[PDB]
Amino acid sequence: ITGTSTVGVGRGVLGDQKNINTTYSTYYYLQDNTRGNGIFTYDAKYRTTLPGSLWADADNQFFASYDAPAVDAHYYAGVTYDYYKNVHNRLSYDGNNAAIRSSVHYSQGYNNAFWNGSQMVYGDGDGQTFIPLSGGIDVVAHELTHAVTDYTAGLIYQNESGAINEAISDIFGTLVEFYANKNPDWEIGEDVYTPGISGDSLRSMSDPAKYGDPDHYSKRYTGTQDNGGVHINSGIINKAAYLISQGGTHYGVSVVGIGRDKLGKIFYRALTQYLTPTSNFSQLRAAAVQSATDLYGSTSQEVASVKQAFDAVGVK
Ligand SMILES: CC(C)C[C@H](NC(=O)[C@H](Cc1ccccc1)NP(=O)(O)CNC(=O)OCc1ccccc1)C(=O)O
Ligand SMILES: [Ca+2]
Ligand SMILES: [Ca+2]
Ligand SMILES: [Ca+2]
Ligand SMILES: [Ca+2]
Ligand SMILES: [Zn+2]
């Protein structure tokens, strides 16, 4: 909408206060004009038609319980925007500052979030398996990263290419979590998963097997559920990414960690310059080796660590 940029204040899903960029035109709208061609957050009003209505508020104060999922979808989209711009020189998900749109309060009791080809969509959770999923910065950056993937590598959402697609979203969700630096970890979805159980999460990059996902290619799932295991076999690549960054000895293979920033540079380059819609794990290893070579040189520690990490998870 046309109007003047303003700054509202509210509380997110976990009860934290934050400022949000709004637009004033009779109402205050969740429209952030300070980033690209805008960040827009919508109310889906517990139904499934999208996007719903642009979020409108009479006084620019967002402290109602109903407001909290919108506050966080809007604010964490801004953080993820800033990560890609500041860290990778990428302007929004298409590289050309496309408007970023999110809807919250999708459906009823909805235990998921997704990128529908055009926008991010967040359920409120059923209060037991999940709380509103936009309360997790790793969830929001996981979803915006699906858009990035779709505009770059284009990884098909099934079997090995789909598990790479999923790992790319968990990896950058985690790097954005560290970027914002609030309780960062290598776990996935812990801020919004199982409110009655502390300390758990939906997936783990540091130890995928903790929640039954494979941490070696020999343990890969090859049936048909979950699009051929895309949220399952992602654990093989998440573990490799964790090892590249943090190091460790896994099934007897030792990896020298090179840190998060260099993991992010290497995988961003792989995603945008070498992966294609049909890449499999072995082709991801090659793409990451070539990306590290480009960035740090063929005889670097960074290249050797990438090789060690994929050897450790059984990917040649
Ligand atoms: C239980 C569920 C949340 C797990 C899993 N979903 C997820 O892991 C994440 C949500 C998330 C939760 C916690 C941390 C980070 C991300 N959702 P996602 O984006 O991977 C769901 N993808 C998805 O819905 O893909 C199907 C699709 C929809 C529309 C258009 C084309 C294709 C799944 O869908 O199986
Ligand atoms: Ca208000
Ligand atoms: Ca965390
Ligand atoms: Ca996390
Ligand atoms: Ca929990
Ligand atoms: Zn995903």
The DSSP line for the chain is: ---EEEEEEEE-TTS-EEEEEEEEESEEESEETTSTT-EEEEE-TTSS-SS-EE-EESSSEE-SGGGHHHHHHHHHHHHHHHHHHHHH---STTSS---EEEEEEESSS---EEE-SSSEEEE---SSSBS-GGG-HHHHHHHHHHHHHHHTT---SSHHHHHHHHHHHHHHHHHHHHHHTSS--SEESTTTB-TTSTT--SEESS-GGGGT--SSGGG---SSHHHHHTTTTHHHHHHHHHHHHH-EEETTEEE----HHHHHHHHHHIIIII--TT--HHHHHHHHHHHHHHHH-TTSHHHHHHHHHHHHTT--
What φ, ψ does residue 305 adopt, rounded to 5°? -70, -40
CA of 297 to the centre of ligand 6 (A): 32
> Could you give the dihedral angle defined by the CA atoms of residues 305, 309, 311 and 312, in that order, rounded to the nearest 10 degrees?
130
Structural domains present in the chain? 6-154 (3.10.170.10), 155-315 (1.10.390.10)
- Nearest C-alpha neighbor of 33 from the set 68, 41, 69: 41
- Tell me the C-alpha to C-alpha distance, in Å, between residue 195 and each of 100, 189, 250: 29, 11, 31
**CA-192 nearest atom, ligand 1:** 13
24 Cα–ligand 3 center, Å: 33
In the structure encoding, which two tokens stand for residue 77, read together?
Answer: 């989209």
DSSP-derived pairing of the beta strands 56-57 and 27-29: antiparallel
Catalytic site residue 302? no
Cα(first)–Cα(last) distance of the chain, in Å? 51
Q: How many CB atoms are closer than 10 A to CB 57?
A: 17
At 216, which amino acid appears? Answer: H
> At residue 189, what is the residue type?
G
Give, in degrees to the nearest 5, the angle at Cα 220 between 281 and 313: 60
The answer, yes or no, to whether any atom of ligand 1 lies below 6 A from the CB of 52, is: no
Q: Which residues contact 165 (CB under 8 A, 6 or more apart)?
A: 146, 149, 153, 155, 156, 157, 230
Instruction: Name the experimental technique.
Output: X-ray
